[PDB]
C-alpha cells in the first residue's frame, strides 16, 4: 500500500 500511495502522491 505504501508504493501505491507514494506513486499517487508523485503523479498528482
Amino acid at each position, epitope marked *: *500500500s*505504501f*508504493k501505491e*500511495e*507514494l*506513486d499517487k*502522491y*508523485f*503523479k*498528482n
Partner: antibody
Amino acid sequence: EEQLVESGGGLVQPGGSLRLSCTASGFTLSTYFMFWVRQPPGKGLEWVSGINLGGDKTWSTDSVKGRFTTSKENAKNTLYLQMDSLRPEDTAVYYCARLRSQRGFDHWGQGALVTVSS
Amino acid sequence: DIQMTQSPSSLSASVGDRVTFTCRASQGVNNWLAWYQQKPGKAPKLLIYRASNLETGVPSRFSGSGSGTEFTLTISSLQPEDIATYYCQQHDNFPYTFGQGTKVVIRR
C-alpha cells in the same frame, strides 16, 4: 522559511536505543511524505525509511527492518525515528528529507551524527 | 528494479569550462529523474527536477536533458563554488535508485 531541524544525536552502546526528532519550521509537514536517510563515514547515501501523510503506512529497508521504527506527530510538526538494537554499521549521519509531489527531495536537515561504540 | 549508472565517476576541469555528466537507465523511466548536488559533509541539494527543469535558488548555469534512458546534466561555466558530487536519481518506480556519483575537481 522552510527549514528542517534535527535533534537526538549522540553516543549509544551497541544494542542500545536512540530516538531522533526532525521538526519542520516552515511548512505543515502533513501534505509531504517524509524520509530518513543515513550516510556512513566514507560511504555513499543509503535511504533507510519513509512515512506517508497520516503515518498509517511505513517503509524500511531489509537491513534495518524490525530494528528501526518511524512515527510522526503533525500537531508538534515532528518526525520521530526510534532506533533499537544498534550495531556498528549504523554509525552514520542521519538526515530527514521532504518530498514534493512532482519535484523529488527538496529540503533536508543539517544532519545528526549517531555513533555506536562501546 | 531500475539501475542508474553515471559517467564519468570523476572529472577534473578548469574554471569556466563546460562539463557534462551522463546518467544511463537500465529501462524506461519517462522523465522522472532528478539531479542532486552534495558537498562533503553537508546535505544534498536539489538541482534538476523532471530531468529538464530548474529548482529555485540554484544558479542558471545548470541545465538538463534526457529522453528515456540517457539523461544529461551540463554546467555551462564551472565555478569554484561547484566542487561537489553530483548524482542522478530516478523517481518513476519505488525504490528511488541513485547513481554512483560524479566528483568534480578544479584544475588551477
